[PDB]
Design a protein around this ligand. Structure first.
Ligand code: HEC
Length: 108
């Protein structure tokens, strides 16, 4: 139910196949369709500098941690109604744990 650390190696592969199309992770990385994700954890939503968010994403004002990130990625539009992230989600809990384990380090 809660987040448990997993395989960052698998998480990186998940990011390439599922996220890299719309996202980058390094500091100073370019925005694409979606925002650069550097410094995302321990930060309130809508605060990637340079990126223009929806009202939905800003109004949600979620302080991103591993658990709500997992809930978010299960079904983005369910968690933040009106968001323009055209992504259906990661339904498998193992995938979400793996992906988030990678993200926490890659956006550190
Ligand atoms: C497009 C094809 C996307 C894919 C695939 C993924 N994401 Fe995304 N994401 C996208 C957009 C356009 C946005 C902004 C939505 C808005 O309402 O403005 C997002 C947003 C996020 C966020 C929130 C960032 C914030 O600062 O609040 C996160 C944390 C995020 N995306 C993560 C993420 C992950 C982990 C993905 C794959 C595993 C992923 N996204 C795919 C566009 C797209």
């Amino acid at each position: 139910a809660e987040f448990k650390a997993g395989s960052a190696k698998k998480g990186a592969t998940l990011f390439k196949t599922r996220c890299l199309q719309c996202h980058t992770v390094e500091k100073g990385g370019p925005h694409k369709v979606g925002p650069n994700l550097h410094g995302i954890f321990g930060r309130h939503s809508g605060q990637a500098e340079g990126y223009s968010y929806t009202d939905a994403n800003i109004k949600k004002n979620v302080l991103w941690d591993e658990n709500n990130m997992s809930e978010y990625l299960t079904n983005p539009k369910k968690y933040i109604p009106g968001t323009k992230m055209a992504f259906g989600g990661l339904k498998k809990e193992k995938d979400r744990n793996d992906l988030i384990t990678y993200l926490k380090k890659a956006t550190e």
